[PDB]
Amino acid sequence: YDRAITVFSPDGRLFQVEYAREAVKKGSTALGMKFANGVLLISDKKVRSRLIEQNSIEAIQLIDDYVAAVTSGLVADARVLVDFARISAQQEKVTYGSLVNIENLVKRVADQMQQYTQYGGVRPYGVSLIFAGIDQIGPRLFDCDPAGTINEYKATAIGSGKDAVVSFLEREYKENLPEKEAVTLGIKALKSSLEEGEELKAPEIASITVGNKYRIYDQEEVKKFL
Amino acid sequence: YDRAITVFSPDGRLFQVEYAREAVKKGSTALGMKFANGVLLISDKKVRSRLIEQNSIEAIQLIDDYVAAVTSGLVADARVLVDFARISAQQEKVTYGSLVNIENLVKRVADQMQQYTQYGGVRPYGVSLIFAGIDQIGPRLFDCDPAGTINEYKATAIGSGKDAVVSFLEREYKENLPEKEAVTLGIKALKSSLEEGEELKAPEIASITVGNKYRIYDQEEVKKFL
Amino acid sequence: YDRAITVFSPDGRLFQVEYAREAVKKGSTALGMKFANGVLLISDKKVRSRLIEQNSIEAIQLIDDYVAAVTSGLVADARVLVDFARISAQQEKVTYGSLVNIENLVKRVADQMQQYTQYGGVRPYGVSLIFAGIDQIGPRLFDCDPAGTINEYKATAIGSGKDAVVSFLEREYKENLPEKEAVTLGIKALKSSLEEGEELKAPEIASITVGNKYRIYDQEEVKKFL
Amino acid sequence: YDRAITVFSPDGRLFQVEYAREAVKKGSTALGMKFANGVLLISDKKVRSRLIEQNSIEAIQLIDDYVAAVTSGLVADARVLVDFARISAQQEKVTYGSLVNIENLVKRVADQMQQYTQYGGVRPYGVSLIFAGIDQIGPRLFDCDPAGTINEYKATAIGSGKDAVVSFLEREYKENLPEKEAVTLGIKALKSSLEEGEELKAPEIASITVGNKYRIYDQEEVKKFL
Amino acid sequence: YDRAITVFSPDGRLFQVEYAREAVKKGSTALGMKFANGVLLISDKKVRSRLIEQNSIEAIQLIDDYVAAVTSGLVADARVLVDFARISAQQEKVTYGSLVNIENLVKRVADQMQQYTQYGGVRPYGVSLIFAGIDQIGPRLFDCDPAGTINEYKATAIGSGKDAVVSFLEREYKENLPEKEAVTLGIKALKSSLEEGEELKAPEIASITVGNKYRIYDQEEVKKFL
Amino acid sequence: YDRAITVFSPDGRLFQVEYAREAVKKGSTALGMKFANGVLLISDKKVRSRLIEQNSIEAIQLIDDYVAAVTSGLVADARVLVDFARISAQQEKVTYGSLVNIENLVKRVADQMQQYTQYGGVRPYGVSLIFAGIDQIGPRLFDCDPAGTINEYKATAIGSGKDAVVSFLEREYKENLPEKEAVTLGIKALKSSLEEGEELKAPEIASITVGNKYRIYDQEEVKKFL
Amino acid sequence: YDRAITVFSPDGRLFQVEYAREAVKKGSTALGMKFANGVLLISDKKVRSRLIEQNSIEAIQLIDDYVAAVTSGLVADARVLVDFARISAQQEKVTYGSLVNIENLVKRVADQMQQYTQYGGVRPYGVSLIFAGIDQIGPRLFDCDPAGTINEYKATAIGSGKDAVVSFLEREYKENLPEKEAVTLGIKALKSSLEEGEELKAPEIASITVGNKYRIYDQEEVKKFL
Amino acid sequence: TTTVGITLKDAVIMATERRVTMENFIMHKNGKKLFQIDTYTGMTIAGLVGDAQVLVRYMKAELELYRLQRRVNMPIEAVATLLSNMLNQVKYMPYMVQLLVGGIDTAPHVFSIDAAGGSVEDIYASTGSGSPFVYGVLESQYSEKMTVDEGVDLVIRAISAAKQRDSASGGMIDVAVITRKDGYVQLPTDQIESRIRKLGLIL
Amino acid sequence: TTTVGITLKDAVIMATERRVTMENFIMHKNGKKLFQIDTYTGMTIAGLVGDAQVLVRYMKAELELYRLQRRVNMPIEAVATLLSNMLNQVKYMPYMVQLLVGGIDTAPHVFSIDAAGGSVEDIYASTGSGSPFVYGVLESQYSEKMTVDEGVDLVIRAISAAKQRDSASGGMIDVAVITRKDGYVQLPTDQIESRIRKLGLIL
Questions:
Q1: Judging by beta carbons within 10 Å of its beta carbon (0-12, 13-18, 19+), is residue D23 exposed, middle or buried?
Q2: Cβ neighbours, 10 Å, residue E65
Q3: Do the Cβ atoms of E79 and D148 come within 8 Å?
Q4: Nearest CA to CA, how far is G62 from chain H (Å)?
Q5: What angle do CA C150, C152, C158 make, to 5 degrees?
Q6: What is the 8-class DSSP label of residue I188?
Q7: Angle at E81 between CA E75 and CA E87, to 5 degrees
Q8: Helix (H) or strand (E) holding F117
Q9: What is the distance between the alpha carbons of residues H24 and G9, in angstroms, rounded to a whole number?
Q10: Which chain H residue has its CA at the smallest distance from G94's CA?
Q11: Helix and strand numbers, DSSP H then E, in chain C
């Protein structure tokens, strides 16, 4: 109908960018939340076969030593967009000397997604991401949308368990929270949704507290909170 | 019908630019009005969930210390267009030394929107904005349209409550008005429309008086006028 | 049918450029006429709401101190094309030292419109303009057409009241005429057409006499001729 | 059918270039003929309203002091193509010092028309022209076609009265002819066709005799031959 | 079907290049043949009206003093392609000092036609040509095809009387032949086909013998062989 | 439906990239596995006719002396993509001095495939590859997908016998394994699938152990394990 | 269906590249085979009319003094692709000093064909070629496919008699063979297929033995083996 | 360096010396300055070594592509015109080389092309540092009525005088006579030693 | 600096010294100027250090890409022609380097390429500041009938004379004999010390 390249609807809809949002609804679930002095990111990692090199596939990826990202949607678009975010953070390190705002970093990536929402001859990025980290302002937690829409959260989700996890977070989130109870609350969120295949697995989870660099857990530590 | 890229109608209509106007009718309401020696901008901000970082999402955004903007429509197109307006104001600061006309600034942004109204291979900007601020001429209040149409007002609206708010302003607006009664009239306008979900919330609202720089209210001050 | 980008008809028509002409038939009416030693331009200005900043919206716009223009059609295309005419007049001031022919100025703008009549990937300019002013040759009054067609008149119209006004001018125009009786004849023309909503309003009207610069009336002077 | 951009037919037709030829059949009639030591061009000029500035609209336009052109078809495409012919003649004056062949000049313009006959993304030039003037070879009279086809004549026509005028010329043309009887024969040709609205008007008509420059008649002289 | 830009068929056909070949079947007939020490080219020239400047329209056109060409098909594409062949021969004169092979010259022109057979966004050249002349190798006679196919002949045809003439040549051609009997055989070929409108006319015909330059006949000489 | 260039679905599918995955399902089967201190790649090679130069067609192709690749899908796209991988490995040798990560090499090739998944005017690469080799990290075994999706394995397959081989590997793979029993397990995998035409043939198979360069078997050695 | 520019199928097919393969099935047959110390290429040449300059049309064309090519399919695409192969061999002579691998030469030409298999806005090359010659490695015989697929043979065919000739070669080919019995076997292959019009003709045939340059037979020598 | 090219009745004889310097410092006692550029024409080298070898590679390339496409050898005026166009399309980043192409197409030719691309026929030509010595002996001893053997003896005497009187010239002379009947043939070094020992130019 | 490359019967021997300056001021007493450029050929370095290392990286790159694509080693005339084309495509922003590539494909070769891209074979070649000393001893002592051991002893005596008589040359000599049977092998430093102590060139 030319409802198949990014142009407007009979009533106010971009059908392709919608269709990208249902592409990111078909992905793997992941979430994140702020705690008392930092922010976490937990992805579900559902290592399906035993032949997959469990730990070496990573969906929580680092953009800097002071911004991380976990993604959901088409995984190839995800990898390309995360690499754009990495080189953009490096551009801001070369230009200004430091990454003073993480909001600038999510805004440049989201402008990149708005362009392929705007122009024809190309489809939108069918991928959604959440960014987390501390800057001069403090702990920040963002979200990104196939249109390039950004919103800032105290806690958010993405993926197949978007809505179920966001309902649990909408009920049971407490703003200032020690790190241990925070990752416990996050795992309970990931559980309640993903325990419909009656299994969770060991998830992957990273954290920062303001002042320190990045710490991604190992295989042994996450099973204590599991 | 190729009624899906910006070309003309069987009778004098640009169907895509229409479809962008019904896209900006689906947005969040916002309005603005001049008062005795300045101009205000009030956005509704309807912070839906409790996980949204209430004050850090801002729809009244500054283009300069002497021009501000509140937007409505697709929020990604909004952010990209507002950043274009910011760098255009900075171009005029580099070239001429000061921002002597705010009408020049709305006209350049509106030419930017007319281009993507004009050319194929790309959709229009599905976003509408109002610009407010003082220049050498004095207080000015503009509007912007998905075609790039600009009109100058003493008071205008945008968003889902376009028509209801514009009806209240059409009846009850007084031209020269002290700032307090002006923001009270603006909140009554925002109320009468948005009190159909039987709630308003604390809105966000900024003001200038001619001579001073920009002042965006805090959370506590707006509830006194609420 | 590919009757939706500018290509030829089964019999000799450009359907898109037609569709642009019915877009300029949907506009606001405006007209102009030569008098004994100059030329006038009167636009209807129908200030609909009371919130519109009546005098600050101007549809008679200056291209030079010695060429003016009033436009009709899509107002965004109008503003972009008028700005092109302004910078083209300034190019001729840089290159030749003065604007010796106003016909050169209307021809460059009309070539600009012919291009977007000619090429695909873009729609025509859905706008019509009349140019007026004196040059070395004397008083000239032109017209412009969505195809880029120019014609020179002693008096012409444009807009919703194209045909009614042109019928009145076809009957009652006198070639050499003092300025006062000229603006009276122009207002009678604007009346007879636009008095179908049983109102006219104060119109906007400018004039030149050969030798002097530009004079746009104020609000008080036009009501004496009204 | 994609029979609406310039590609080939089920049997050997360029449908768009046809459609341009029926666009030039809808134009105003014009003709030309050689006489004993030169060539003439007569356009019908049917000044419809009294508000048109009768003499200042000219369809016989000069390309040089030693080549002229009268056009028929879409008048905007006509003006753009005539300006191309003018600057091409000026290119040959800069490069070679003089315009030694007028056939080179019609061939460059016709190559320009063949390109937009050849490429997609753009329509043909819906315009036809005849070129006339003397060169080193002598008096020449050409024709041009929306495909870029050129043919050389002793006498030819163009416009709405193509066929009727060409029938009269096919019967009653004499090769070597004094200028007065030549313009009389041309007016009889223009009459027999255009006297179906039972009026002709004063036409516009120019002539050269080999050795002299260009002479376009005035209003008074043509009515003696009328 | 996208059988309207040059792409492949359900079985091995280029429909547009076919449609160009039926466009060159609709043209004017022309032929050529080698004789004992050279080669001739005879075009039919059917001067239809008496107003056409009989001798000045030429379809046998010179590419060099040592290569000539007669063309058939769309006459505008013909003129553009012949001018390409002329400037290519001049390029080889600049680069190598002489036109040592005429096969190189037909191959470059045929590569030019293959490109517009290959690419989209443009139609093929709907024109066919035969090239004739002597080089270092000797007398050569080529043919060209809307795909860019070249074949070398001792005698060939092109145009509306392709098949009838090629049948007569297939029966009655003798390889080594004096020039007079050669042009007589060529005229008999042109006759047998074109004498279906029960007329031939004076044709146009050129010849070279190896060692000499180019000789195009005059009006009087061809009627002796007619 | 424009479900024939890479844009999104009514529900979250890229139909063209799917269609490329069923294109790589139609290919020849190939697999690979890590062993105790290295990794192997075995392709089926089914030399169909006797006229094919059996050993000179190679589907296990070297990208470096320390990365190899076996491919499946469209063989032309395969060869072009493998050559891109070769010159990319050489770029990293020029820039950094050595190929320190093989994951970087698969990621650049996969970004190359994501681009033609992303843009219109071009189809995706209808090819899948597995990369194998040691780097500073150790033995790695990757896979590549027509979208550009990469996954890391201990053992994987590709081709017509994707699913049957992956089922056998899912049951019977042991992680640390001497090279001889590893190639025996790989041949049993290739057998169980490809023994549906009741034949296997001699396959082609290469191996590395960490520290050494590349060794592709000869014809005699593989038949001992067959 | 957009199954008329090169994009993927509902199941794993490139319909345009198929359609190019049935275009090369409609061509003239040609074949080649290795012998004891070299390789031959025999084309059928079926000189249809007597007016074709029998020996001067050549389908076995030289790419170097040490690589030759015979082609089948669309003959214009053939000539353009063979000229690309010639200038590519010359590039390798300028760059490396000699043509050390003929496989590099077929791979570059095949990459050229893969590009127009890959991109839209253009059709594939509807042509197939076989390359033959000796390099440092020895005698090589390749094939090329409208997708760009290459395969190496000891003997292969192309054209209308693809399958019949390949069946005869599949039965009766002997690997090491003296040149005389090799060209006899090749002619028997060409016979068995092409003797369905109950005629063969004199074919054209070339050979190399390793160490010597190129030898294309004359008309008299091939009839001894006929 | 010194090169020579002599046109006689039905043959054209070209020879160079073989010594490359590349420094002051004669570095290579056996270079290659005489190149077979097509089946019936050759080229000598008397300029900068790298630029000259790139010119030889390009001319071998274009003349072989020529013979392959058109199936006839390129004329000598055509190859020297092509070489002039190449040397004159880039003259403000020029090739510092003095070229001398010679061959036979229907008549024996030798042309001389400078670094700016000026080609001009002469019956005998020479390029190089030791050029005026071979022009002296060719001016004093050359005859257009010579045979091929008298011509190649004149060539060897010329290059021998240039080696005796010039520092940059030296090494073993390689001579190649190109005629229409036998094609481009280069004389073996034992035959050239035999001609030197016959003419009495060895010490 | 000084490099040397000697072709004998079925082997080609190349060696450099190891001293980098980079200033006047000899800065690095152990450099690397002899590089294995493919499995049967190597390259020496006697110019500007940075430009030379970039040339070595590009030639390792193109020859490994070559061996991977075509599965055969590149000939020595082919690698030196490629190197000449690279050095001559940019000569007005040139690489100030003197190269010397040597290896074996069907016969042992060593070529010498200057900064302008002029490649020319010789039976022995040398580049560097200490080049004329090793050309003196190679001119006085070289024989084409040598064995590999006599050749590497000649090479060590050459570079030793250049170290004794030249300031920019010095450091421990690294020598690598490339033959067809054993491939590119580089002699260990203890063996080179043993040859120096045997020949009596230590003090």
A1: buried
A2: 13
A3: yes
A4: 6
A5: 70
A6: -
A7: 140
A8: helix F102-118
A9: 70
A10: H57
A11: 6, 10
CA distance B130 to E113: 56
Cis peptide, bond prior to residue I22, ω within 30 of zero:
yes
- Residue B223's domain comprises 1-226
> Which residues of chain H from 68 to 107 reach within 8 Å of chain E, CB to CB?
69-70, 72, 74-75, 77-78, 81-82, 85
Are B150 and C77 within 8 A, CB to CB? no
**What is the rounded CA–CA span in Å between residue C186 and residue C41?**
9
Task: Report the gap between the CA of C93 and the closest CA in chain D (Å).
Answer: 21
Neighbours of D48 (CB within 10 A): 8
- Residues in chain G with CB shorter than 8 Å from the CB of E11 are 19, 22, 26
| CB C133, CB C64: distance < 8 Å | yes
- Buried b / exposed e across A182-197, counting CB within 10 Å, b at 16+? bbebbbebbbbbbeee
Is residue H7 annotated as a catalytic residue, yes or no? Answer: no
Phi, psi of F189 (to 5 degrees): -60, -50
Distance separating alpha carbons of residues D110 and H84, to the nearest angstrom? 37
Contact at 8 Å (CB) between H53 and I119?
yes
DSSP H helices, F63-101, are: 75-96
CB contact (8 A) between residue B76 and residue A154: no
Tokens 């001069």 locate to A136
Tokens, residue B69: 């903007």
8 Å CB contact between H51 and H97:
yes
Quote the number of domains for chain D: 1
Q: Are H170 and H163 in contact (CB under 8 A)?
A: yes
Out of F12, F107, F152, name the one closest to residue A22 (CB).
F12
Q: What is the Cα Rg of chain G in Å?
A: 17
Contact G170 F51 (CB under 8 A): yes
Mutate to test the interface with I, among F62, F63, F213 (most CBs of I within 10 A): F62
**Which residues does chain I have within 8 Å of residue H50's beta carbon, measured at their own beta carbons?**
84, 87-88, 91, 114, 116-119
Provide the 10 A C-beta neighbour count for residue F37: 17
* DSSP assignment string, chain B: ---SSS-B-SSS-BHHHHHHHHHHHTS--EEEEEETTEEEEEE-----SSSB-TTTS-SEEEEETTEEEEEEE-HHHHHHHHHHHHHHHHHHHHHHSS---HHHHHHHHHHHHHHHHHBSSB----EEEEEEEE-SS-EEEEEE-TT--EEEBSEEEESTTSHHHHHHHHHH--SS--HHHHHHHHHHHHHHHHTTSS-----EEEEEETTS--EE--HHHHHHH-
Is A102 within 8 Å of A113 (Cβ atoms)? no
What is the spatial distance between Cα D42 and Cα D35, in angstroms, rounded to a whole number? 13
Count CA within 13 A, CB hemisphere, residue D102: 24
Q: Which structural technique was applied? A: cryo-EM
- Tokens representing F142 are 């990757």
Of E39, E14, E22, E24, the residue nearest E81 (C-alpha): E24
Is residue D154 within 8 Å of D36, Cβ to Cβ? no
Alpha helices in D69-121 (DSSP H): 75-96, 102-118
State residue H108 phi and psi, 5-degree precision.
Answer: -70, 135
Dig out the tokens for H168 from the structure. 């940059």
Measured in angstroms, the resolution is 2.9
H68/G93 CB distance under 8 A: no
Residue I180 tokens read as 């067809």
DSSP bridge partners of D128? D72
Only one residue has tokens 């009416």, namely C29
Contact G97 H57 (CB under 8 A): yes
Is the CB of residue I199 less than 8 Å away from at least one CB of chain F? Answer: no
CB I165, CB I146: distance < 8 Å: no
The pair of structure tokens assigned to E225 is: 């062989």
Residue H41 bridge partners (DSSP): H38, H103
DSSP letter assigned to residue I86: H
